[PDB]
């Protein structure tokens, strides 16, 4: 008789893996002991199609940082997770004064301490985030870009002046909370090609679902 599992909050609950920061010792990848992850809810594969069932959405997010080495080993390392809110300058070096700017909330935590966790509010200057924007921000390459959807950035790094003794990995999990949505729309039925637009492979336009031999044979 109950219907709680079909509420928007239920449909969008749970903490999913949205980001993975690699901090290798030797390597081509993130060579400066730091990394800048712009917040992307699309990080969880499955999310894009789900949020896109609606046109406008509003919500908060709880971020959880699970860090360890690539073998899942736990080591005595101090880390810094800095949230640089939209409009703020991200660090460009392991020695950027941004890491020290007070207005960028930072959490300092040990890899041994349990996962760090914080809450990020609805950041948009608009009344709601919107996955679709039929327009251009004051043929073009700016079509469909709603910028007022920036949630901020998380700058990760080991603490200290000298490189860390250990190879690390920080997994970022995000739980959406206090969800509200408007204007439902048809559910994506063609594979995605680009993060920013609805472009679809015009050669490979597949039917929404499975087919059969004849309409009279089950």
């Amino acid at each position: 008789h109950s219907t709680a599992e079909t509420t928007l909050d239920s449909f969008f609950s749970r903490a999913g893996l949205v980001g993975e920061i690699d901090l290798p010792l030797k390597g081509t990848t993130n060579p400066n002991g730091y990394a800048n992850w712009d917040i992307d809810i699309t990080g969880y594969a499955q999310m894009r199609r789900k949020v896109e069932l609606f046109t406008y959405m509003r919500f908060d997010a709880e971020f959880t940082f699970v860090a360890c080495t690539p073998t899942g080993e736990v080591v005595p390392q101090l880390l810094q997770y800095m949230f640089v809110p939209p409009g703020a300058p991200k660090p460009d070096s392991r020695e950027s004064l941004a890491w020290q700017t007070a207005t960028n909330p930072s959490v300092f935590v040990k890899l041994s301490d349990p996962p760090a966790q914080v809450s990020v509010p609805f950041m948009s200057p608009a009344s709601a985030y919107q996955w679709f924007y039929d327009g251009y921000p004051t043929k073009d390459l700016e079509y469909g870009a709603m910028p007022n959807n920036m949630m901020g950035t998380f700058s990760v790094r080991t603490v200290g002046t000298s490189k860390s003794k250990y190879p690390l990995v920080v997994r970022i999990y995000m739980r959406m909370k206090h969800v509200r949505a408007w204007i439902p729309r048809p559910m994506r039925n063609q594979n995605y090609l680009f993060k920013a637009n609805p472009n679809y492979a015009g050669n490979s336009i597949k039917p929404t679902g499975a087919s059969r031999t004849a309409i009279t044979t089950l």
């Binding site: 789900k50 948009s124 597949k206 499975a210």
Partner: protein, 239 residues
Amino acid sequence: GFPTELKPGTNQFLTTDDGVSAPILPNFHPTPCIHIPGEVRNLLELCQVETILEVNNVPTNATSLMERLRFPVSAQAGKGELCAVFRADPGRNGPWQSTLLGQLCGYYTQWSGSLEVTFMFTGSFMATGKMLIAYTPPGGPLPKDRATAMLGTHVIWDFGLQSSVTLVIPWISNTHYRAHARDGVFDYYTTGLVSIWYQTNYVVPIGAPNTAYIIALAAAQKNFTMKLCKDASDILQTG
């Protein structure tokens, strides 16, 4: 201080724990919400909205995809012929896959309730005739002929008199658990069948087309529900 004992579970991170965490920007005041028309609060609202049922899920040719949205009835057909047939299986592969209802069932594991399918005849105004739409409950097998189909639950639809007609699937329940290959699914078995038969031949006067199409719309009834969230999709965000 105050005496405490940490209990098992201490320090764990459960992806589904819905606790509370420290606010990053305590002084920040989010822009206020205004009123936006069309808020949805429960997916079941969408489930109750009729969408096109691709009963004719046959052509795959890219330029013929639009044909899946409608099946035909024609003069050529003789009284009694089976026109089309499909099962009431929202969550499984097939025609319902085109319906928003079928798509949403894909985000859940179990479900049940009544369904509704509306058939819209889009032939000429001058065209007339009768079709027999029949529902064969689960277990029951597709009727050998019109005659026997008539003995069961059915509707004689005169598209001369009314242009639309709605059939009600009394009940479907995707609850029986299965463990086939090595992958455990929660499948129906409650496949009731909807069969459409020509009761009369398609009648038309000179100047009217000899082929018309029927569009099928479907949705779940108000007593419909879904359980166990299950994120699954082939369409995922790209690299």
